Amino acid sequence: PLDFQSIIMKLQQFWAEQGSLIWQPYYTQVGAGTMNPATFLRVLGPEPWNVAYVEPSIRPDDGRYGENPNRLQQHYQFQVILKPDPGNPQEIYLRSLEALGIDPREHDIRFVEDNWESPALGAWGLGWEVWLDGLEITQFTYFQQAGGMVLEPVSVEITYGLERIAMALQRVSNFRDIRWNAERTYGDVNLQGEREHSTYYFEVADVERLRQMFALFEAEAEAALARGLVLPAHDYVLKSSHTFNVLDTRGAVGVTERQVLFARMRDMARRVAEAYVAQRQALGFPWLIPEQETLLIEIGTEELPPADLEAALAQLRQRVPALLDELHLPHGDVQVWGTPRRLVVWVEDLAGRQPDRELIIKGPPANRAFDAEGRPTAAAEGFARSKGVPVEALTVAEMDGGRYVVAHVRETGRPAVEVLAEVLPGVIADLRFERSMRWNSSGVAFSRPIRWLVALHGETVIPFTYAGLTSGRVTRGLRFAEPATFALSHPRDYRIFLERQGVVVEPEIRRARIAEQARTLIADVGGDPEHLDEAVLNEVTHLVEAPTALRGRFEDEYLRLPEEVLVSVMKKHQRYFPVYTREGQLLPYFIAVRNGGKEGLDVVTDGNEQVIRARFADAAYFIREDLKHPLEYYLPRLSTLTFQAKLGSMLDKTHRIEVLVERLIPMVGLEAEDAAAVRRAAHLSKADLVTHMVVEMTSLQGVMGRYYALQSGEPRAVAEAIFEAYLPRFAGDRYPETPAGLVLGLADRLDTLMGLFAVGLAPTGTKDPFALRRAALGLVQNLIHWNLDFDLRQGLEAAAQGLPVPVSPEAKMESLEFIVGRLQNELLEQGYRYDVVAAVLAAQGHNPAATARGVRELSAWVSRSDWNTILPAYARSVRITRDQTERFAIDPARLVEPAEKHLLSALLQAEVTPRRPGSVEDFFQVFLPMIPVINRFFDEVLVMAEDAGLRANRLGLLQRIVALADGVADFSKLEGFE
């Protein structure tokens, strides 16, 4: 097992044997190897560049005083850049691991999607993290943009994590135990540095002096850029970035300060990059038969993400059958398969030749093609000259509505090989992914680089080129299997070759085999095999080609941690199946899936056990630090955390939520005991957001707040309300069940909705960073679940009164309509008729719980037999009262006709009747007795004329009848109303 310095020297030697230039760490504190000029500048422009160098990366935020086995303010990376794309960077990288004594034939090396985005450098790329038996040991990225510029040629960045590789090779669980050389350990030479640098970065560094430093460094960078001095500018930009990072660690960077300073650093870095490219350009870039037969299409790729693989499979299924039809090729069943490295199209029976076809080409209409005598006009001659036929060969046919002159072409039936070769490049190019990357000079963008192409129709290769590749009959197996490439004489050999290596190319078969192996291992240890998460199974199906599940153990002591922590680590980080008993107590086991066989599985199982041990230990040390102080202690740290630019910090949001909760208590009607909990929980609602555990696992917000509040001695009703504030977290989640949790999340969502709309940042398209759609949806779902009557106007008005920005009446009205808007989708998703929902929303939209009741009741009142006999009395009353511009007062002394006085009696009984606000039931229970009295009134009484007093009384009666529906429904919204 190599020393730390031996690992570095083996990597340098290996990459020098590849022809790379060996570089040196940079003389300024940088946060990553990428910030070294050897990367950040050399990837710009068209000139080639192969470099490798060590870089001690400095991240002041990551300092843990040398106590955390993995967390260091300084860690040594090994940075490799390949430019242009060599064609096989993954295989070269695997040969470098081999040179370090890591055999891919004995360990499970995986490429798992992890994209790179550095806004500080205006850069992004697509790639993976590399797993060594589950251990992240390398970042592998194809750079697409840097300094705001589109990169060409694309560069490959390979960043080795040296501490993690050395800990794996040396079987040490701790950075201090790494052997540097025969005499000294990593901790012997760096432990005091980690301790002292962490103490300075967190406790000692003077904030005013750091701000002065930043101003000086920026001013000198601007002065250097003014002279076109690229590297002195780059140096001072780096020094500004480090000074800003140390300022952030001291917790002095404000909300607006962070956005201003980051914009200045981004603009400087962009100008440095542009100045470097202009400098290189001024130098002139100095470094420059046939039958019925089977079809097999394989698009060989580097490891595709599951979402991209699944999207590609669906588009191939929707297109390949249709495309064969448009070729008029008789075919059998079309099967589409896929692994992370493969897109496979399989057509069992396919015609070797097209049938001959007669093609009819529509031309000008006959009215313009022929004269009065029937002879062709110049319009028919031109259309004839456009094709290759004389005008005498044109005929007339009836196609689309009318008669058009047509031309006849006898297209010859071509072989399937000849016609498929013309379309297959266009098939691949039409595949669409959420994010795409290019990698070579062809300019083709794809999810991940395409490395080989197979196109077989029996024994004949379909010849075409795409992405710089040439189609053929050679496929690749597993990287660590022999042979690496296999020439296919016929598609029947393909399924044979993969199945010898254990590769299951059929996705649905692969998913079944994984669940089969996993349930066996869970059953053999006494666990419930039905408790198998479907999300993990779907992702892990697309992380392997030759699955082989394994079971590992972790120490029993780690079960003392919260289950949500252990479950989140195994499922979200490692993609492991946790093991549950019949009771549903967590078991000290995990199920992992190897991309390999059953031989040597013990080596891979040991590596995965060491990985999960480290991850649980990391969570333990995070929890250890968070337990040092009560949850209330972390409130001042929230001032360092940004909620929104104009709205302030999370501590400001906490203060707003406290005030809004106090207003909501009388509006909801909480008892004294629940009033105490909601007040206390709002004080601690966001306190966990600055704990180490939540910072690492942001999904555990609320969960850790519950835990830390319990251990701090807070009442359980306070702790549970902290967790319940986020409920529901997703569709199908739990609902809040304590009143304090309901009111807390009620205030959290109202402040968020009212705050964002007050500044005009409503969601647009797919851009919803604040999840305002979920906040409005959970707002109405929780109220309907509790059936709590609530006026959203009063809720929004109370939130607006506490905002730090101006709130307009239009913004308050806009927030309401947005929430009401999301309310109808919830009701529409439950199946209620759209016109029924609209009639109730127009009158009761402000109250989502009352709207839910009204829609349910009104839905039953329609579709019933006697419904057509109920509304018309109301509708006829509405019809006559539409055009009126005033409400008419009623003087009963002027009533003459018997039906007038009887309608007044019926209406006065209806008005005096106490009814519940918005009750549809109480509306019909009061209107139904009036219907016979209203009908007799219309037949026996003339309404509109003629005396003014009689018309006012008769219209007033009809107006007050319409008013009986006020606050219940707008029945004119129903379809049958007209």
Add this chain to the structure above:
Amino acid sequence: PLDFQSIIMKLQQFWAEQGSLIWQPYYTQVGAGTMNPATFLRVLGPEPWNVAYVEPSIRPDDGRYGENPNRLQQHYQFQVILKPDPGNPQEIYLRSLEALGIDPREHDIRFVEDNWESPALGAWGLGWEVWLDGLEITQFTYFQQAGGMVLEPVSVEITYGLERIAMALQRVSNFRDIRWNAERTYGDVNLQGEREHSTYYFEVADVERLRQMFALFEAEAEAALARGLVLPAHDYVLKSSHTFNVLDTRGAVGVTERQVLFARMRDMARRVAEAYVAQRQALGFPWLIPEQETLLIEIGTEELPPADLEAALAQLRQRVPALLDELHLPHGDVQVWGTPRRLVVWVEDLAGRQPDRELIIKGPPANRAFDAEGRPTAAAEGFARSKGVPVEALTVAEMDGGRYVVAHVRETGRPAVEVLAEVLPGVIADLRFERSMRWNSSGVAFSRPIRWLVALHGETVIPFTYAGLTSGRVTRGLRFAEPATFALSHPRDYRIFLERQGVVVEPEIRRARIAEQARTLIADVGGDPEHLDEAVLNEVTHLVEAPTALRGRFEDEYLRLPEEVLVSVMKKHQRYFPVYTREGQLLPYFIAVRNGGKEGLDVVTDGNEQVIRARFADAAYFIREDLKHPLEYYLPRLSTLTFQAKLGSMLDKTHRIEVLVERLIPMVGLEAEDAAAVRRAAHLSKADLVTHMVVEMTSLQGVMGRYYALQSGEPRAVAEAIFEAYLPRFAGDRYPETPAGLVLGLADRLDTLMGLFAVGLAPTGTKDPFALRRAALGLVQNLIHWNLDFDLRQGLEAAAQGLPVPVSPEAKMESLEFIVGRLQNELLEQGYRYDVVAAVLAAQGHNPAATARGVRELSAWVSRSDWNTILPAYARSVRITRDQTERFAIDPARLVEPAEKHLLSALLQAEVTPRRPGSVEDFFQVFLPMIPVINRFFDEVLVMAELRANRLGLLQRIVALADGVADFSKLEGFENL
């Protein structure tokens, strides 16, 4: 031929195989790998530490925009630290060079004295610069102090110069052409950085922002130290040090500010170092017999500097003969030889045994040790008890003018081997060098480490221990020869073994053999073999053990350069012999001396040829850049240079030299042609100091000004004056010939002396920073040999009115007395009597020309056969006239004595006689005829009569004839009269 990265990886591989820990360059701009905490912090305390790492060292002052072929603001060093001393670090280093393509058996790897110091970190040590066939490639240092702490154990620092190693291996002359890998060159990747960083360090960096940065960094270092944070404080000390270097590169730091800032950085570095050591201590330091026979004593050392070697040989030549006598050991001739690695003591026919001896120990006086009855007293009993004798065995000896009680001890004659073993450690320790260094746990300081000891009395080894070593019979030859060690059965084998390797241990023989070999090589190309510089021959002799002179050639093109430029490069920098014709023209050849044999001499020759080709091309490139602009353009750039704080810059000195020259023209007397020449010369006098050649070669001052003036189109009379101003540069140098050069030399020297005296910087004892001793002497020398009469008081006064600071009249008296003092020494340099030179100096001291003429004339008169018969008439009159401090009128009314009347008649003819001013001969020709008349007046008449004013007045005027000639009371025999 290795690539740049291959050189780095091969060094990392080699030192990793020695056991070293491989480190990484530090994440902040440092001037040297020493400033990396892997060196500065780790050399502190007792814990061991073996490290090797690359370090891009940033020295902003060394940037040349990438235009220079070898000057870079960023050099890639390879830093190696061995702690503690391994016992053979030089040999390990040589094996590391062998791991590259460099075989010490084929190349000349030489260690030449160069002691290293980091003034910002308060670190220093003694050591060498390593030269590979003439090219400096490594700094090799034994650290003694770091951060004000005495280092124990001492650490070895080896700092490879990677660019120069690569240039030698790849046979390229420009850093641009160094291959980094198969695709890129060093220039491809670093040229734009060299240009941009040079531009920022020299032109762009804002002084106020840097000074703010410096203050901020220092304040954060203080805050970090107050919390015990060692590494953050060290980081801010490095940052402040880099900022200070950038400041100095922008010209914003003066002499006083430079010293203040360096001291404050040292104090921070001291407190960082002490904090580090206290931190490690709190951790418990976790990382812890014939009739006669020949005598041969060899002290094997690492390469001793020439001055330390000469001092050791002289101290051994004076002490060993006396030491052997004090041992009462009969011996023959004592010879002391030495090479840079050897101190050798050779004594023929040394007695094998001491003679038996009786020792007499002086004690109390006889009277105080015996009573009246002759019985011994308590003093005698105590003196006897203090020795090993009873009081009855005491006797009385008559010695030192009295009677004393003595004790008798009979000392046995012991063998020479046994008694020499007791004194040889003390002999080595008593050796004194200007600077000494420790290297191991014994604590012994020496010039360089001692590595082996030989001590043979015939076949028998003298057993003693000195610097953690043990004397034996084993010596070492040349490092690259077989065998490396050799056991001596008898001292007669020692000389045969060394001569077999070509080692010439005798310094006189070694010097002679080099001259023999050089003469042969010069004669083969038609040169003058008797033209060999003595200073090079003395230096070269003490840099080799086995001399083998070689002849290299350089291209004829470089002969177009000035001869003084080519010669100074060869002699001062490279220690080569220039090759001249007998007519005096320079030839395209040089003679170097290899420390080795004739096998593989072609490789060593080619290496030196490439080195000299590069040093000449640098000079040609330096001259090209200087010639692009007239010499007048460099005049305002002289404000960058500094003469002396409180006096002004070079531009300030040139101005007050221009004013002084115009003052000097009337006093000397120059025609219209020469007056205009000196006025233009004084304007351009110091303009060369800021050119490329003078900055690289400080000794080329004046030489290059003349060459640049001629190229600018200036007249030859102006150009020669710019060069002749410095003459004489040294003892034996030639004098100025053009009067413009002379007068310009006067203005330069008068202003330098009187100005440095006005600021109180008068030399005291020894060590004068300014050449006031030479400036005063060359002034006094140039006035003679010209026979130009000149008043120094008037000249010093004329320079005083040009000085900015106030001129104390004592400074004029002090400055004048100093100039007259150097005049006396020069006159005593010639075989001139002290009294005669003082007699004429008392009257004519202000005029060196007059004094020179007076000393010559008075010396001739003093050495005459009748000189004792000329003075005493004058001396007698002076004796009487010595008293009565007042003039006396010679009123003719009192004339009563006939003889007294003749004296006035004879005297009156003396004043009327034409006498050349300050002429001794004219005084004598006027005084000699008055000797009989002054004698008769002495006999007949009587002075001091009861009339006396006439007697005293006549005598006082007789003594007044010497006024302006001399004193005559300084003469040795003047008392006799």
